[PDB]
């Protein structure tokens, strides 16, 4: 939760969630502004699930 995927390779480096989730979204071929324009909707769906 705190540092993403960088704590398995070497040392731990911190990062905020909206940026970490933007990276994850970019990982599957969707441009990263889509997350920034839909943050509240995405959070609501996550909590409901």
């Amino acid at each position: 939760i705190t540092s993403g995927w960088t704590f398995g390779a070497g040392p731990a480096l911190q990062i905020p969630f909206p940026m970490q989730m933007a990276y994850r979204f970019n990982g599957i071929g969707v441009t990263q502004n889509v997350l920034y324009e839909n943050q509240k909707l995405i959070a609501n769906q996550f909590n409901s699930a």
Binding site: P18, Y36, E37, Q39
Partner: peptide
């Protein structure tokens, strides 16, 4: 630039105006 959260102000350079100044 009104919908994003935590967006800051700055200046963005342009690589054509210095050339077109002359």
């Amino acid at each position: 630039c009104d919908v994003v959260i935590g967006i800051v102000n700055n200046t963005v350079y342009d690589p054509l105006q210095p050339e077109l100044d002359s």
